[PDB]
């Protein structure tokens, strides 16, 4: 059946010697009631209300009518028989249903029998379902439908004992009725034993008739008397038997403290260490099983453990995602190299680290993921991206993390998040720190141990930073590109930067410095400088930027400058400038004294005309002079060759010359927005351009012959 | 229902019995409560408490009323009846009971009840499961769930055996049982047979009952007495069978010895002989399954067979690694053709034998493999690696190995453990012993068949070699290339290379030779050689090597030479040159007379300058200068054009010559390790030049215009 896994070996023994005492107490009721009579005789001599029991023997006259002999057998029957002779079968029966109501109440009792139901359904779904056979083999592939319904066993055993460790009723109704059994076994036996001697053959009634009969004392005999005798004693035995087992049973749940479950023989032999043992009212439930078969709790012993549920998920993260599945969602960055990105995962899949090719991995929002080591198999693995992810790590890995990581970018939004390991990585070369280091007024020891990394190349703090560290300042001797994104935050320099001299890149996006430090004049080494959103107001310190022998991509986009400074043609070694998003009325002609540039670009901003001067520049290969009020351009514009893209946006151009057939490099023109009526000719006189090469208005497109619109879409094919 | 299998014929006759004696209890207990009395006669002539029984015939008056009759009857029945008389049907029934509860004692004792659900469940299952099916039809295509399923009731099969060979509870309780019915039935005949004979009609009573009715004894009938003797005749009778059957029950269970279960007959007839016997408390259940049926033991004998779990597991491969998994497996190995590896596999799926495109199988670690005949279908198959694997292999594909084998590789530690059949291989062309072949006090016996293949080329001997064995100097003269390798161990020739006359590589790596040998200056056909690891002093004996006209890859790396012999000039020859990892002052000139040198490589060595005449090496392709303490380069050397790659690696140098700009076939040069500051701007402009192939340091890539970095790296996609 069902519940037979719940009764012990007393339990059953208590059930069949109740059944016994059953069959011995109707056995004697239907005795009793079937006859019982008590056959009386009065004796002529009487010796103190007693018989004195003192030619040929002839019979005793004693003239009673048959009906006087039934009223004496009645009334002796009823007054001078022991009320035990005539009601033991009743007492027995009486004491057996108790003995059964005390035995099945808590089997009864709703509020009890719900548990009970609800842990033997959950103790047969546990013991049968096929990942316990799997986790006791243990001590690779399951099916979906399999994982489901295990991750469900698991979710539905946590609830259940969460909600019964708080009731505590089960086993206080377990030991209330075996206190009542005992106390009743020890009831039954003391009462039984002093009135089983009572019940005997031949009794003496004087019953005090002698208005009806004539005679006053009667020898009766009492034909059931020594069936009765013999049926007490089996009873006693019995009753013996059953006060032994309660006893026992009282015994064994008073000498455990049942509320309390050990549960260290498989967590010190199947070393699954991870099982906290119960609390009251389940180690009951627990208890009873091992003394059924200790079977069912070991295999029911799984679904309470952490990392049965840990290598549950990982195996479902396998199934769900399968090597050719994941090869699909590899996905290639900025810098062309192979990206592994995961956003919302439960975990890191062991199935990742089976692409060898894999080369950038990207965490995203996991919960407490931990590198297992086979990221040893990988080989061309060199950026790991952690943003709002906690990954530790362990022994091998973190040591082949030590021999082959190159780059490591995490967001944070508190330091406790950030991983204890990222020091132990000496050989990393680029780090993108886009938290908050900005702690409870310290001074940035949470990053005071980025001296560890001897081979740190790049830096990439955007952590709103109010000054630039004391850490940062003694890392970046050997530091080639530094990188601070302020968020708009305060930064003040205040002499720090003269410290680094071996620096090429010194980005300031958004560090509101709203002056140009004095310490970047120092860095004779930079290359690149760039300086979104500092709310610079005057770039005159160009004027000390020619002793900087390798400044070539001066960057001052995202700013507010009037006029760009005469100093420009103090240097000559620009190639890439960026002055974008400006409010600038005078473009300088001393500008174009730096014959080497190359990606010159001034779009949205205030300017109102293209000096003739620009073919003097004939190393230009883009310009993008989009929004911006630029009437007409000047022809000069068109004297270079080597320029590639032209952007010409949102401008009042009335008229384009028709010169454009002269530069054959250009690539890339955008001229939507702009007040044409008609355009040049010869715009087909260019062999290298594309449909996305002309970015113009469908309107005046066809004013041009149709000759080179079909050309163009001849070209445009593949 | 589900145990009548664990009830053998002695059971199920003594539960009909029993019931047939429970019958017989009841009809008695019926009869003796509806009526049992016994009609007593008062006798007027006595003789010794015994009636003496001594016109027309009158009844006799005995002046008795009928309940002084009724009242003698009781007082007769309860003192002069024998008690067996009116108790025979209760002792009936509680022998009955007794023998009921001894007999289902186990079925209902928690303890051994739920090993018996347990071991019942186990043989139901695999009783009809199509994996015993397909074993006993053995004495093709088997489906995942099928397979997945016979592979899990292995594994619980395996566990319960475990979990049961310690019991010892189910067979100590049917022993104890069985003693317990046997002792019961003899008590019960017995006493039964003694005092059968107390049961009789006539019965004479002296009770002594004078003032109640006044007369002393009285002659009794028990009506009942006929009836009560036959049944206990035909009680005694049942007693009897049940004894007997009883006592063959311990006669079959007292000369088996019933804990050790043969198990010899079906591993005798079916060839499964690996089926170990099974201890106590698992022996008895296969006992009593043979009394029931031995056919349930014959299918479930096969899931206790080593060769049933094997077969299972091959076929449970052949499954799991589909003919696209192992086409997707397939690898290039260094040699450039279709090579697939194996590793730790417990055998060889017989779908990798369908991949004709495969020409390299490599083994290691799998034991007991078995090379089928379906070997024959591959084609392409031409080298085996049998990586500490013995393998063996039947007649067809023994033929089609001889056929169709080109090379071997085998790893060992133990003579035994490599094929026997190998010198059966005729068509085999290179050998790879990778074990330790050095047996105790022979002259290398096992290896001795090398003279079977005589068509070998290749020899990769490394076994650590103290004496070179004779067969592999009978066997040299017709063999091409001989690697041996000693790890260290000590080699000595004493003119064992003179045999070979047509060897050409000689590679001698850590043989420990620790000075050149002089039986290498016979083989005159030698083209390529080499001494790493063996501990050379001095090598002074080039001119011994002047008649070695084909020498032209003398390798001579990883020892200690002083300084190199001047007569290197002698030969002209050297093409491939190494004598890396020494310790050398000076190159002399002469060396650099040949003119054909192509690999010429001093790494490591502790030299001083590079003369001149390094600048007459016109044929000159890859020189490695990595470690040396080169001061300059002499500028002689840069005038050379056939130059492909020059690696300098932890060298003293302070800048870079300025001619480096005029080649155009260098192809690759390294200088990393180096203090230089300065990249001469020439080096930027040469026909084969990729960021691959120039590898620098980071900070010293910056001191170069950028214009030609842009079309460098817009060349390096392709």
Same mark, same amino acid.
């Given at each position: 059946?069902?519940? &037979?896994? !719940?009764?012990?070996?007393?339990?059953?023994?208590?059930?069949?010697?109740?059944?016994?005492?059953?069959?011995?107490?109707?056995?004697?009721?239907?005795?009793?009631?079937?006859?019982?009579?008590?056959?009386?005789?009065?004796?002529? #001599?009487?010796?103190?209300?007693?018989? %004195?029991?003192?030619?040929?023997?002839?019979?005793?006259? @004693?003239?009673?009518?048959?009906?006087?002999?039934?009223?004496?057998?009645?009334?002796? @029957?009823?007054? &001078?028989?022991?009320?035990?002779?005539?009601?033991?079968?009743? $007492?027995?029966?009486?004491?057996?249903?108790?003995?059964?109501?005390?035995?099945?109440?808590?089997?009864?009792?709703?509020?009890?029998?719900?548990?009970?139901?609800?842990?033997?359904?959950?103790?047969?779904?546990?013991?049968?379902?096929? #990942?316990?056979?799997?986790?006791?083999?243990?001590?690779?592939?399951?099916?979906?439908?399999?994982?489901?319904?295990?991750?469900?066993?698991?979710?539905?055993?946590?609830?259940?004992?969460?909600?019964?460790?708080?009731?505590?009723?089960?086993?206080?109704?377990?030991?209330?009725?075996?206190?009542?059994?005992?106390?009743?076994?020890?009831?039954?036996?003391? @009462?039984?034993?002093?009135?089983?001697?009572?019940?005997?053959?031949?009794?003496?009634?004087?019953?005090?008739?002698?208005?009806?009969?004539?005679?006053?004392?009667?020898?009766?005999?009492?034909?059931?008397?020594?069936?009765?005798?013999?049926?007490?004693?089996?009873?006693?035995?019995?009753?013996?038997?059953?006060?032994?087992?309660?006893?026992?049973?009282?015994?064994?749940?008073?000498?455990?403290?049942?509320?309390?479950?050990?549960?260290?023989?498989?967590?010190?032999?199947?070393?699954?260490?991870?099982?906290?043992?119960?609390?009251?009212?389940?180690?009951?439930?627990?208890? /009873?099983?091992?003394?059924?078969?200790?079977? @069912?709790?070991?295999?029911?012993?799984?679904?309470?453990?952490?990392?049965?549920?840990?290598?549950?998920?990982?195996?479902?993260? %396998?199934?769900? #995602?399968?090597?050719?599945? !994941?090869?699909?969602?590899?996905?290639?960055?900025?810098?062309?190299?192979?990206?592994?990105?995961?956003?919302?995962?439960?975990?890191?899949?062991?199935?990742?680290?089976?692409?060898?090719?894999?080369?950038?991995?990207?965490?995203?929002?996991?919960?407490?993921?931990?590198?297992?080591?086979?990221?040893?198999?990988?080989?061309?693995?060199?950026?790991?991206? $952690?943003?709002? +992810?906690?990954?530790?790590?362990?022994?091998?890995?973190?040591?082949?993390?030590?021999?082959?990581?190159?780059?490591?970018?995490?967001?944070?939004?508190?330091?406790?998040?950030?991983?204890?390991?990222?020091?132990?990585?000496?050989?990393?070369?680029?780090?993108?720190?886009?938290?908050?280091?900005?702690?409870?007024?310290?001074?940035?020891?949470?990053?005071?141990?980025?001296?560890?990394?001897?081979?740190?190349?790049?830096?990439?703090?955007?952590?709103?930073?109010?000054?630039?560290?004391?850490?940062?300042?003694?890392?970046?001797?050997?530091?080639?590109?530094?990188?601070?994104?302020?968020?708009?935050?305060?930064?003040?320099?205040?002499?720090?930067?003269?410290?680094?001299?071996?620096? +090429?890149? $010194?980005?300031?996006?958004?560090?509101?410095?709203?002056?140009?430090?004095?310490?970047?004049?120092?860095?004779?080494?930079?290359?690149?400088?760039?300086?979104?959103?500092?709310?610079?107001?005057?770039?005159?310190?160009?004027?000390?930027?020619?002793?900087?022998?390798?400044?070539?991509?001066?960057?001052?986009?995202?700013?507010?400058?009037?006029?760009?400074?005469?100093?420009?043609?103090?240097?000559?070694?620009?190639?890439?400038?960026? /002055?974008?998003?400006?409010?600038?009325?005078?473009?300088?002609?001393?500008?174009?004294?730096?014959?080497?540039?190359?990606?010159?670009?001034?779009?949205?901003?205030?300017?109102?005309?293209?000096?003739?001067?620009?073919? !003097?520049?004939?190393?230009?290969?883009?310009?993008?002079?989009?929004?911006?009020?630029?009437?007409?351009?000047?022809?000069?514009?068109?004297?270079?060759?080597?320029?590639?893209?032209?952007?010409?946006?949102? %401008?009042?151009?009335?008229?384009?010359?028709?010169?454009?057939?002269?530069?054959?490099? !250009?690539?890339?023109?955008?001229?939507?927005?702009?007040?044409?009526?008609?355009?040049?000719?010869?715009?087909?006189?260019?062999?290298?351009?594309?449909?996305?090469?002309?970015?113009?208005?469908?309107?005046?497109?066809?004013?041009?012959?149709?000759?080179?619109?079909?050309?163009? #879409?001849?070209?445009?094919?593949?």
């Amino acid at each position: 059946p069902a519940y &037979r896994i !719940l009764k012990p070996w007393w339990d059953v023994f208590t059930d069949y010697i109740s059944i016994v005492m059953l069959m011995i107490a109707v056995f004697g009721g239907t005795l009793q009631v079937t006859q019982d009579k008590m056959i009386c005789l009065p004796c002529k #001599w009487v010796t103190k209300d007693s018989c %004195n029991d003192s030619t040929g023997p002839t019979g005793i006259k @004693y003239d009673l009518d048959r009906h006087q002999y039934n009223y004496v057998d009645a009334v002796c @029957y009823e007054n &001078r028989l022991h009320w035990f002779a005539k009601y033991f079968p009743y $007492l027995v029966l009486l004491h057996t249903l108790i003995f059964l109501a005390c035995s099945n109440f808590w089997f009864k009792f709703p509020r009890t029998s719900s548990k009970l139901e609800h842990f033997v359904s959950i103790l047969l779904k546990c013991f049968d379902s096929p #990942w316990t056979t799997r986790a006791l083999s243990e001590t690779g592939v399951l099916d979906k439908k399999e994982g489901e319904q295990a991750k469900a066993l698991f979710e539905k055993v946590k609830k259940f004992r969460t909600h019964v460790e708080e009731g505590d009723i089960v086993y206080r109704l377990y030991m209330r009725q075996t206190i009542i059994k005992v106390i009743k076994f020890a009831l039954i036996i003391c @009462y039984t034993v002093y009135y089983v001697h009572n019940i005997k053959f031949d009794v003496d009634c004087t019953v005090d008739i002698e208005s009806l009969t004539g005679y006053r004392t009667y020898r009766c005999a009492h034909p059931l008397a020594t069936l009765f005798k013999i049926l007490a004693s089996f009873y006693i035995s019995l009753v013996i038997f059953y006060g032994l087992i309660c006893m026992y049973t009282l015994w064994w749940m008073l000498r455990r403290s049942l509320k309390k479950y050990s549960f260290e023989s498989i967590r010190e032999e199947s070393s699954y260490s991870d099982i906290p043992d119960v609390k009251n009212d389940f180690a009951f439930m627990l208890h /009873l099983i091992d003394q059924y078969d200790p079977l @069912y709790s070991k295999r029911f012993a799984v679904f309470l453990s952490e990392v049965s549920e840990n290598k549950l998920r990982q195996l479902n993260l %396998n199934n769900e #995602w399968t090597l050719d599945k !994941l090869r699909q969602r590899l996905t290639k960055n900025a810098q062309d190299k192979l990206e592994l990105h995961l956003f919302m995962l439960s975990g890191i899949p062991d199935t990742v680290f089976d692409l060898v090719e894999l080369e950038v991995l990207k965490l995203e929002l996991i919960p407490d993921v931990t590198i297992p080591p086979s990221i040893a198999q990988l080989t061309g693995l060199k950026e790991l991206w $952690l943003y709002h +992810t906690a990954a530790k790590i362990e022994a091998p890995a973190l040591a082949f993390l030590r021999e082959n990581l190159r780059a490591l970018h995490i967001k944070f939004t508190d330091i406790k998040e950030i991983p204890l390991w990222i020091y132990s990585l000496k050989t990393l070369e680029e780090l993108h720190l886009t938290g908050n280091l900005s702690a409870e007024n310290n001074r940035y020891i949470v990053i005071d141990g980025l001296r560890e990394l001897k081979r740190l190349k790049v830096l990439r703090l955007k952590s709103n930073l109010s000054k630039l560290p004391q850490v940062v300042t003694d890392v970046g001797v050997h530091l080639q590109k530094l990188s601070i994104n302020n968020e708009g935050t305060k930064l003040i320099v205040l002499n720090s930067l003269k410290k680094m001299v071996n620096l +090429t890149e $010194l980005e300031l996006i958004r560090c509101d410095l709203e002056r140009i430090p004095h310490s970047i004049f120092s860095l004779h080494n930079l290359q690149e400088i760039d300086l979104k959103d500092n709310n610079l107001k005057t770039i005159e310190e160009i004027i000390s930027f020619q002793h900087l022998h390798r400044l070539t991509c001066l960057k001052l986009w995202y700013n507010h400058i009037a006029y760009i400074p005469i100093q420009i043609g103090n240097l000559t070694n620009l190639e890439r400038l960026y /002055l974008n998003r400006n409010k600038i009325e005078k473009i300088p002609t001393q500008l174009f004294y730096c014959r080497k540039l190359r990606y010159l670009d001034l779009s949205h901003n205030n300017l109102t005309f293209l000096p003739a001067d620009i073919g !003097l520049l004939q190393n230009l290969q883009n310009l993008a002079v989009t929004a911006n009020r630029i009437e007409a351009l000047p022809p000069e514009l068109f004297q270079c060759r080597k320029l590639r893209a032209l952007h010409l946006g949102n %401008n009042v151009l009335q008229s384009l010359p028709s010169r454009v057939g002269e530069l054959t490099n !250009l690539t890339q023109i955008e001229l939507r927005g702009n007040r044409l009526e008609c355009l040049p000719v010869e715009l087909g006189e260019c062999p290298l351009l594309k449909r996305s090469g002309l970015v113009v208005e469908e309107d005046l497109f066809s004013t041009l012959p149709p000759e080179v619109k079909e050309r163009l #879409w001849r070209a445009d094919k593949e």
